[PDB]
Amino acid sequence: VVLPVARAGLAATAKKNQYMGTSVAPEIVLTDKGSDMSRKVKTEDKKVAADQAAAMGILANMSLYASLNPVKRMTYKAKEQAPAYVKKTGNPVEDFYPSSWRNMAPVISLSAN
Amino acid sequence: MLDAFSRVVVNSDAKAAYVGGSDLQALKSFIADGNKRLDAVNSIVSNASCMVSDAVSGMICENPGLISPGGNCYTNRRMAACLRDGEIILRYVSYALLAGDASVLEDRCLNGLKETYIALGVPTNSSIRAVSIMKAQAVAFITNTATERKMSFAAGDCTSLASEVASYFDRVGAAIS
Amino acid sequence: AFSRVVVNSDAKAAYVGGSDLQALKSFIADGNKRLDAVNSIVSNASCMVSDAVSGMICENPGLISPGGNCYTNRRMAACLRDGEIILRYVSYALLAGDASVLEDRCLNGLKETYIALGVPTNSSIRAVSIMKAQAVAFITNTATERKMSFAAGDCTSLASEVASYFDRVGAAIS
Amino acid sequence: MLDAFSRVVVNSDAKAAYVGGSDLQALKSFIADGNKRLDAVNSIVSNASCMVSDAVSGMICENPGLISPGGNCYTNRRMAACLRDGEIILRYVSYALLAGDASVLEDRCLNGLKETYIALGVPTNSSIRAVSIMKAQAVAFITNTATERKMSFAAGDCTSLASEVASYFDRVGAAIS
Amino acid sequence: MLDAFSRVVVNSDAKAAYVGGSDLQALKSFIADGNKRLDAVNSIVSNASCMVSDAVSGMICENPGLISPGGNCYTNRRMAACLRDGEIILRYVSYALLAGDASVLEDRCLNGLKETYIALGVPTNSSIRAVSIMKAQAVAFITNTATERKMSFAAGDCTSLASEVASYFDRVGAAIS
Amino acid sequence: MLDAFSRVVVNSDAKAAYVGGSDLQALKSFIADGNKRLDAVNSIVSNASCMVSDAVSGMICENPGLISPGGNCYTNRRMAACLRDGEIILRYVSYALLAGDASVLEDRCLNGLKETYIALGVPTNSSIRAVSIMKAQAVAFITNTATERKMSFAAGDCTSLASEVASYFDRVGAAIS
Amino acid sequence: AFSSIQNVLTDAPLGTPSAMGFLDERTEKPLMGPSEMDELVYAVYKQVFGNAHIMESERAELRDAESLFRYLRDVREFVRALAKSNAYTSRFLQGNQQYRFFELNFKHLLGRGPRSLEEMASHSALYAEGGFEAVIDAILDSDEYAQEFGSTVVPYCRFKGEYPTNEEFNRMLVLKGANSTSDKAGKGRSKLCYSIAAGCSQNWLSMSKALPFGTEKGTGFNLISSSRNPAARPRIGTKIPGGVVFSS
Amino acid sequence: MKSVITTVVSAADAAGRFPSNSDLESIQGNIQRSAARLEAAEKLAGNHEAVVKEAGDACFAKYAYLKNPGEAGENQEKINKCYRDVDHYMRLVNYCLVVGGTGPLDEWGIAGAREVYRTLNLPTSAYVASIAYTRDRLCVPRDMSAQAGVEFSAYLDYLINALS
Ligand SMILES: C=CC1=C(C)[C@@H](Cc2[nH]c(/C=C3N=C(/C=C4\NC(=O)[C@H](C)[C@H]4CC)C(C)=C\3CCC(=O)O)c(CCC(=O)O)c2C)NC1=O
Ligand SMILES: C=CC1=C(C)[C@@H](Cc2[nH]c(/C=C3N=C(/C=C4\NC(=O)[C@H](C)[C@H]4CC)C(C)=C\3CCC(=O)O)c(CCC(=O)O)c2C)NC1=O
Ligand SMILES: C=CC1=C(C)[C@@H](Cc2[nH]c(/C=C3N=C(/C=C4\NC(=O)[C@H](C)[C@H]4CC)C(C)=C\3CCC(=O)O)c(CCC(=O)O)c2C)NC1=O
Ligand SMILES: C=CC1=C(C)[C@@H](Cc2[nH]c(/C=C3N=C(/C=C4\NC(=O)[C@H](C)[C@H]4CC)C(C)=C\3CCC(=O)O)c(CCC(=O)O)c2C)NC1=O
Ligand SMILES: C=CC1=C(C)[C@@H](Cc2[nH]c(/C=C3N=C(/C=C4\NC(=O)[C@H](C)[C@H]4CC)C(C)=C\3CCC(=O)O)c(CCC(=O)O)c2C)NC1=O
Ligand SMILES: C=CC1=C(C)[C@@H](Cc2[nH]c(/C=C3N=C(/C=C4\NC(=O)[C@H](C)[C@H]4CC)C(C)=C\3CCC(=O)O)c(CCC(=O)O)c2C)NC1=O
């Protein structure tokens, strides 16, 4: 006699606010040139965006911060990651040393800090 | 004019609003210490690009399990989405410092955030820790005790505004715990 | 079971900044000695493998002969590549303090490939033991032709660390 | 209870065999580095009451809902019982570091620890933080990478014992999860 | 255990509130009608030996298989244990009427009572019947409407004490069912 | 019908033994390989119309004495019956691959298929060729080595599923051989 | 305080002849003699240790505590000397949890089970200020030990009838078992640990194994659930002449 | 056997169609819940001779009259036939945790049970009291996990309702 999808979709629409997953945020900009008639504040609304490119300046640098920790490679031990779905051919110079990892090696370039 | 800045955030659409020179001069004498509070916003939002970029990387700096195989900051996009929310949390706290009210902080940012993180399986114990780094930056930028960067301010004491922006960061901590 | 450089095909750079180094240098015991450990090696990385391969030629001169495995100038040039790639993974392993990235990205499957490609495995014992005995002499500043200015102190435990790492290469191709 | 020498005995009693010289080189090397094991035990028990004071009050920093009304560490009686438990996990790990074997930590401290903490209602995601804050502080003084309180050791490698303690503190973390 | 004043302050401790004048008007009428609460509990403990023996033998009357071979009120050994038990139940509900809160009846008397009775073989449907007789005996002494034994009171209603003690007798049936 | 889990039950019921230990390890590998099996059943069912038309035509072009007058696939009545006699056999095979055991194929299709085709007068050699082509189409859709259609998968090795479905097709050939 | 099981269906508690022998000035006690002595020592060994089955080369380390017991005839001092032994800590302290050690001290030295979490946590407050000997002498020098056993009788499991909580009778029945039951069968692992800290009760079949002979050991179990629902609010109505009154 | 696999196959075999997208969607639920009910099964498998001893004593505790001369537990060779028939029922619950449905309890324990126990004068209420004791002697994080006890106590509740 009841509709379960209607009266639970309505119950989840009034309790949950409409504003969470839309990723908008009040961006405040202050302008000041020293004078009195130069001092606006602009509290406008912007949907902020997940910046894809600058995460690799954080995800990689912390992945080599934790590579060089002697006492955070123990008490923080990573899980046992499986390799991918690559098929073994039979010749070891393609199986053990594939073309994606052919002649790759780390070069360390120290400088000041 | 101050009530109209709630209306551009309620409407869920990009609409801009601002103050004049004389309307701010009437606002800075209606609210007491209003020049100090606009220095408290400007000390944060000039450095808001560095505060989230240090606190998210500082969360990995004490917990490298988030970048593990199986971690919550992995597959190149979760790290981008982690920087997006710490940008959002720093926007809504600095708007609450600008308004002097946490009533826009709760229902627009913290309402239902606790259920959203456990629906995704976001570890809330690390997201406390990324806010508490940002709380430690916000009392250092306001009191001008930051080591690497000191902005020249007009002299005086701003201890009540630093404790106010401490208390707005605890409400982010209390909602997601 | 390798290390936290698991990042494959995303921009490959991963430097460590200035104040983040103070999060690392207050975390590594003798971290100033270990940063001077790898800087004594990779500053002289070109002179080492030019001397490591030619030290193997100077005791085993049949590699330049036709039928030998350092005739046909690309095949000579592959050995100076693979002389350096062994050195390049050891210098990362001394910096990280573990050999798990060296065992899984470099030494894994090396024995089966050297018998398949016709590489003489016993001569590559000799060419990497030269690079063992070279980098011991760099890290203790007993290199005769060139000495590097350092702060005063000993580096014996890092010298005993790298002799284990070059012996892992000799174990993996035996 | 068992120690590092007695585990070699009770494994070779099970095979009805005398302990030969092929099983003594793990034990003859144990008494060779046995002085620097004892040298690194008393860096933990002499800094112990500061470690429990830091690891509990850092768990309050990451999870601020522990000191809300209805939190687990709310009143003074519940606050002192949390300080007493982190001293006990530190006491039983510092027996197992001294013995070189995780027998005595397992069956007096970890025996039924998970079913106790469920019945009391102690949160398991905050109690694994307090054994992992002091995990990092226990690999501090072994590796001598401490910010304050430098301790005068003798020079050499102690990363075998630093990795052994990090095995022992996650044996607690695998027991109450 | 708690009483009627301690029950209010553990409700306010979940909110960290102060017991102010909104919450105090229930407690200001507990002391205002507090003479009648004392006037009602010596209406029960003055008749308590007659109340137990009538309730137990009134349960034998509606069920004569309790005193045949195989009943669980058969011999003198089992009948004195049934008479002792109904005096314990009437004792703990006179504590609960005096306090004004059913805490002490629920943890000391009723907690774990269902598992004693299904290990000793006690019938619980007839045991509820002996409690339900002395519920009706208790509401007749409080409102002074018993056929014998008119006690000397003062005039007014005790109709909220008679249904408060009827809910304490209903918790005994709900805990052994 | 027995699936892959109730097969090891009847294997252990005849020994009157519990399932646990080593006999549970095959079933944990069945769950881990379970997404490949659902990815494999989907690839056959999606191409089922082209699998039966190309295997009945391939039988006809190699033995053209079926569309001769008097032949067993001569008229339109006999042609549509052969296109349904092989569509049933493909349907009962994919039941056996979805389950993990051939007990749905043997008791509901194969038990009585030899004695059905003898009374009907069906050529026993042409029907084997009709299901041996369909076997060769099955191992090409699971291993993604079809020359006419390529589907999108994740990377990995799935020869064990292709070798398992070729064992089922050898039962429908050996039943009528 | 009637207790229909106690001297009816069980035996009588063992012990020394009287407590007036201490005021006798030419003796210390009614002198039992070495057939009347050692059969009392058999009952202290079966009670402080469970049924531990101590060997001949384990009783030789308890040679000194009996030789004092057959001169100073105090039973409480014999129990105190046996609980500080190596043979009491190598069975009940060494490979057990902390609330397993505490719940056996209530069995071996009081004959009851612990009634509370607050009573149980105060025994770990005495562990912090003196170790395990502060737990043992505080049980022995308590008021509850004085007005039930004293210097005269062995500390036995007493069916009282008038327990201060009903749950105290339940945890006593789980702790003692049958006579073919020792207390090493769990691998550590306190049996009462979940029910003390939560506030629930025990399982009816585990209690009715330890009941005596002749007390309906197990019947009364309906085939639905064995515990109570704390969240249930039932309607229990009383018939008056007119209708039915739900005094809730 | 009633299972997840044999239900969607027989629903499609009776209709004469191929396994569709809804038939594969339910085998996905056999993957998301195999973890909970299989470590409920190996916990029961390793500790079965201690549980059926404790369970079979709960029927001779409540129904102690069965050891009187005349009843079904009259002599010694009939007492271990009760412990055998309880070990049969605990072994079949281990099979239903492995298969994933009530199949081995239906086909092997329940079908034809009431006709057998009535003909041989076996009271079905004491094949129940040993089962209902195992169901409430189950602690939530101690014996198994949280979702492993939900599965284990649902096949015990199935056998209780089927014998009553
Ligand atoms: C205005 C609304 C709004 C917010 C309040 C925040 C909160 C928020 N974050 C995410 C979404 C996310 N949030 C995180 C964040 C974290 N994970 C971690 O490990 C860190 C501790 C932490 C921050 C650094 C991640 C990683 C995702 C992506 C989840 C995923 O990809 O599965 C989502 C998406 C859920 C959905 O769309 O269904 C939302 C609403 N972002 C918003 O758009
Ligand atoms: C958005 C635009 C906008 C601003 C940024 C502010 C900027 C601002 N604040 C002050 C003026 C001031 N600013 C401060 C603030 C501080 N002093 C400290 O030592 C602390 C570091 C810091 C507090 C966090 C104080 C204490 C005064 C003087 C009191 C006052 O004028 O309110 C002045 C006057 C300077 C002068 O004397 O000429 C100005 C221009 N007002 C605006 O309209
Ligand atoms: C000489 C100059 C030079 C370049 C410009 C790059 C260009 C480049 N990038 C990648 C490789 C990659 N490129 C990205 C790209 C991104 N990661 C993100 O998080 C963002 C969404 C996006 C940056 C905008 C990723 C994730 C990889 C890893 C593999 C992949 O996904 O392609 C590759 C493949 C080889 C490799 O993996 O390194 C190449 C050639 N490489 C170079 O050598
Ligand atoms: C090596 C491990 C590692 C870390 C521990 C963190 C580093 C880190 N820095 C700060 C602390 C801070 N972080 C900033 C932020 C900034 N400072 C500036 O000058 C810029 C404008 C801006 C971006 C860099 C400020 C102003 C403080 C407070 C003052 C200070 O300690 O520098 C905090 C919080 C309080 C504290 O513990 O000091 C942490 C956790 N990041 C890491 O990588
Ligand atoms: C044709 C025959 C022929 C040889 C047999 C070798 C000779 C040779 N020299 C070194 C040994 C070395 N080689 C170097 C390398 C260098 N020294 C520097 O100062 C430069 C930076 C760098 C490139 C020249 C160092 C530092 C040592 C160790 C110290 C020394 O012996 O000089 C070794 C290794 C040590 C050993 O003997 O085990 C060998 C085999 N070279 C030859 O040509
Ligand atoms: C919320 C508030 C808050 C705190 C209270 C602290 C609590 C705290 N301290 C440390 C970190 C530490 N704790 C100690 C321990 C001590 N330091 C000494 O010099 C003494 C000997 C001893 C007690 C006073 C040390 C030495 C470190 C530094 C990291 C280390 O060396 O272990 C860590 C992180 C450990 C890690 O993850 O690596 C945390 C969370 N941090 C916070 O965010």
Ligand SMILES: C=CC1=C(C)[C@@H](Cc2[nH]c(/C=C3N=C(/C=C4\NC(=O)[C@H](C)[C@H]4CC)C(C)=C\3CCC(=O)O)c(CCC(=O)O)c2C)NC1=O
């Ligand atoms: C009564 C108690 C008792 C002690 C406290 C120790 C004290 C102690 N430690 C070491 C000795 C040592 N201690 C260390 C340890 C270290 N050196 C470092 O730089 C690291 C930070 C740290 C690793 C944890 C090392 C490497 C030795 C030398 C090895 C050895 O002689 O056994 C020695 C041998 C010689 C010496 O150095 O004095 C002694 C007596 N021994 C005891 O019997």
Ligand SMILES: C=CC1=C(C)[C@@H](Cc2[nH]c(/C=C3N=C(/C=C4\NC(=O)[C@H](C)[C@H]4CC)C(C)=C\3CCC(=O)O)c(CCC(=O)O)c2C)NC1=O
């Ligand atoms: C089979 C045998 C048999 C009995 C023993 C009685 C038992 C009995 N007594 C009362 C009921 C009562 N019993 C008493 C008790 C007493 N009255 C006094 O005046 C004394 C002081 C005191 C001890 C005798 C009271 C006060 C009531 C209820 C008031 C009333 O009777 O009107 C009730 C009614 C309860 C109800 O309605 O559910 C019953 C069934 N009836 C029986 O059928």
Ligand SMILES: C=CC1=C(C)[C@@H](Cc2[nH]c(/C=C3N=C(/C=C4\NC(=O)[C@H](C)[C@H]4CC)C(C)=C\3CCC(=O)O)c(CCC(=O)O)c2C)NC1=O
């Ligand atoms: C120390 C022991 C002790 C007691 C036994 C009671 C005794 C008692 N009861 C009441 C007083 C009273 N008692 C009743 C009760 C009733 N009247 C009826 O008709 C009903 C049958 C019955 C209900 C149960 C009423 C209605 C009052 C007066 C209202 C009041 O003042 O509370 C009073 C106050 C009036 C007076 O002082 O005379 C006292 C002292 N109080 C005590 O301090």
Ligand SMILES: C=CC1=C(C)[C@@H](Cc2[nH]c(/C=C3N=C(/C=C4\NC(=O)[C@H](C)[C@H]4CC)C(C)=C\3CCC(=O)O)c(CCC(=O)O)c2C)NC1=O
């Ligand atoms: C005389 C007439 C005559 C025919 C009709 C075909 C019939 C036919 N097709 C295939 C062989 C095959 N048939 C199919 C089925 C298909 N391939 C596709 O691209 C479609 C998606 C789908 C149905 C149209 C597949 C997938 C193979 C295997 C190789 C491939 O085609 O990629 C085979 C080989 C079977 C075997 O190895 O025994 C035969 C005989 N050949 C003939 O000689």
Ligand SMILES: C=CC1=C(C)[C@@H](Cc2[nH]c(/C=C3N=C(/C=C4\NC(=O)[C@H](C)[C@H]4CC)C(C)=C\3CCC(=O)O)c(CCC(=O)O)c2C)NC1=O
């Ligand atoms: C409801 C319907 C339903 C499906 C259709 C499948 C869909 C499906 N297939 C795979 C996942 C996979 N599927 C295959 C199978 C193959 N890959 C190949 O290269 C071969 C061509 C082919 C047969 C060997 C492989 C190898 C994986 C990778 C993971 C694994 O090996 O289990 C996964 C897991 C990876 C992911 O989640 O993205 C899923 C959900 N599962 C379902 O629940």
Ligand SMILES: C=CC1=C(C)[C@@H](Cc2[nH]c(/C=C3N=C(/C=C4\NC(=O)[C@H](C)[C@H]4CC)C(C)=C\3CCC(=O)O)c(CCC(=O)O)c2C)NC1=O
């Ligand atoms: C820890 C302190 C401690 C001691 C120092 C000894 C001392 C000691 N010995 C005896 C008790 C005794 N001691 C002896 C010993 C002897 N009698 C002789 O004639 C021989 C010369 C001598 C053997 C060398 C005898 C025979 C008894 C028992 C006396 C009796 O039968 O009543 C007793 C009394 C206890 C008892 O009744 O058995 C005590 C305290 N025992 C202790 O527990």
Ligand SMILES: C=CC1=C(C)[C@@H](Cc2[nH]c(/C=C3N=C(/C=C4\NC(=O)[C@H](C)[C@H]4CC)C(C)=C\3CCC(=O)O)c(CCC(=O)O)c2C)NC1=O
């Ligand atoms: C595979 C599934 C499977 C089962 C579940 C059992 C079911 C089962 N149990 C019994 C048989 C029995 N069940 C009982 C049990 C009891 N009698 C009592 O006194 C108490 C009521 C109870 C103790 C628990 C007894 C005594 C018999 C034997 C009856 C007899 O031999 O007369 C029998 C008759 C044949 C026999 O003697 O074993 C069968 C089929 N057997 C199976 O093959």
Ligand SMILES: C=CC1=C(C)[C@@H](Cc2[nH]c(/C=C3N=C(/C=C4\NC(=O)[C@H](C)[C@H]4CC)C(C)=C\3CCC(=O)O)c(CCC(=O)O)c2C)NC1=O
């Ligand atoms: C695979 C089948 C299987 C079951 C049906 C259960 C059943 C079960 N429970 C217990 C044993 C127990 N079960 C409990 C009950 C609890 N413990 C707590 O901490 C909670 C408070 C409460 C659950 C809510 C207790 C306290 C014991 C030990 C006392 C006893 O019953 O003997 C035992 C005896 C074995 C032992 O010594 O542990 C068995 C077989 N366990 C199983 O392995």
